[PDB]
A paper describes a structure:
Here, we describe interactions of the hepatitis A virus (HAV) capsid with components of host endosomal sorting complexes required for transport (ESCRT) that play an essential role in release. We show release of quasi-enveloped virus (eHAV) in exosome-like vesicles requires a conserved export signal located within the 8 kDa C-terminal VP1 pX extension that functions in a manner analogous to late domains of canonical enveloped viruses. Originally identified in virion assembly intermediates and found more recently in extracellular eHAV particles, the pX sequence is unique to hepatoviruses. pX is rapidly cleaved from VP1 upon loss of the eHAV membrane and is not present in nHAV. In this report, we show that pX contains crucial determinants of quasi-envelopment, acting as an adaptor that recruits ESCRT to the viral capsid by binding two distinct Bro1-domain proteins, ALIX and HD-PTP.
Author numbering: 0 to 201
The structure:
């Protein structure tokens, strides 16, 4: 299901912005450019309102989730406002449990083998790898040995020059923030197109 969406789309826009209006415009830009998985981070002011106001894009096939979720209270608001998936930078046992009871897909972030194993023990096999620019594809390749059945979605520094290396290392999808989302709506929509083509291209 959610696994299958990540597998199909291969890219999630990690949307940080200074306002509701900027966040919505960038989410539309990205969608118009072919990115269907959209993660509204909780560093966006009133991130819940943004998720609720983008709810209609679901009817056009957009998949709207929440990122930078750091407490169960934030998790509740996101789900209440229609988030189809929850992402955090870290592994949160409390958010894991809440999302399990609520029946919503949670992708915790991990940076070490010990964190990875704890996440697996909590039932997760699709992991956010964060920050990707610190560990790199090297980390993803290293994990294939001992943990052949874990799959990563790196966030952090993924860009046009390295996106194909990441996929060569064995990642399931990539989460792209500033390389995709920074700039004006027009620039973002265009960069969205470039990433889709570059990803298809490899």
């Amino acid at each position: 299901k959610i696994e299958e969406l990540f597998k199909k789309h291969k890219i999630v826009a990690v949307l940080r912005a200074n306002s509701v209006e900027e966040a919505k415009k960038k989410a539309l830009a990205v969608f118009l450019g072919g990115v269907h998985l959209i993660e509204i981070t909780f560093t966006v002011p009133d991130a819940d309102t943004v998720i609720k106001e983008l709810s209609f894009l679901k009817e056009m096939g957009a998949i709207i989730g929440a990122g930078t979720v750091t407490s169960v209270e934030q998790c509740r608001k996101a789900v209440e406002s229609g988030a189809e998936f929850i992402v955090s930078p870290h592994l949160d046992e409390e958010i894991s449990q809440f999302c399990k009871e609520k029946g919503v897909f949670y992708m915790p972030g991990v940076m070490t083998p010990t964190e990875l194993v704890k996440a697996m023990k909590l039932g997760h096999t699709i992991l956010k790898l964060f920050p990707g620019e610190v560990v790199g594809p090297q980390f993803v390749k290293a994990m294939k040995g001992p943990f052949p059945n874990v799959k990563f979605v790196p966030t952090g520094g993924v860009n046009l020059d390295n996106v194909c290396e990441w996929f060569k290392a064995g990642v399931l999808a990539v989460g792209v923030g500033s390389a995709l989302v920074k700039g004006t709506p027009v620039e973002v929509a265009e960069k969205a197109k470039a990433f889709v083509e570059k990803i298809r291209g490899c």
